[PDB]
């Protein structure tokens, strides 16, 4: 028990690329999110009891988007700060 905002920032920022890319890598490179997003989502939720869960929240939106693989043909799912809402849909803290 000793997680600090910095630690979470180090991993949350690095793992977002390799982690998601791996578990998701299983399917054709289907992941193209931005940093502003990872920071925005967590910033709106910030709800969690450890990084493990946090990473789970990111993976949730990431793959949740992978499922949409049934789209027209747009390859690489872009999860900018806007799409982030379309995927998550709804939030907890309202401004």
Helix (H, G, I), strand (E, B) or coil at 71: coil
Q: Choose among 54, 47, 40, 41: nearest CA to 8.
A: 54
- Within 8 A by CB and 6+ apart from 75, the residues are 28, 29, 30
Residue range(s) defining the domain that contains residue 58: 1-95
Q: What CATH number did the domain enclosing 70 receive?
A: 1.10.8.60
Method in brief: NMR
Q: Choose among 57, 18, 19, 64: nearest CA to 38.
A: 57
Rounded to whole angstroms, how far apart are CA atoms 62 and 78? Answer: 10
Q: Give the number of domains in the chain.
A: 1
């Amino acid at each position: 028990a000793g997680y600090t905002e910095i630690e979470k920032l180090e991993i949350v920022k690095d793992h977002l690329l390799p982690k998601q890319i791996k578990e998701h890598g299983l399917k054709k490179s289907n992941l193209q999110l931005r940093d502003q997003a990872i920071l925005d989502i967590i910033r709106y939720y910030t709800r969690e009891a450890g990084v493990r869960s946090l990473e789970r929240q990111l993976a949730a939106i990431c793959r949740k988007a992978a499922k949409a693989i049934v789209a027209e043909e747009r390859k690489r799912i872009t999860v900018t700060e806007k799409n982030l809402q379309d995927f998550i849909g709804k939030r907890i803290f309202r401004y």
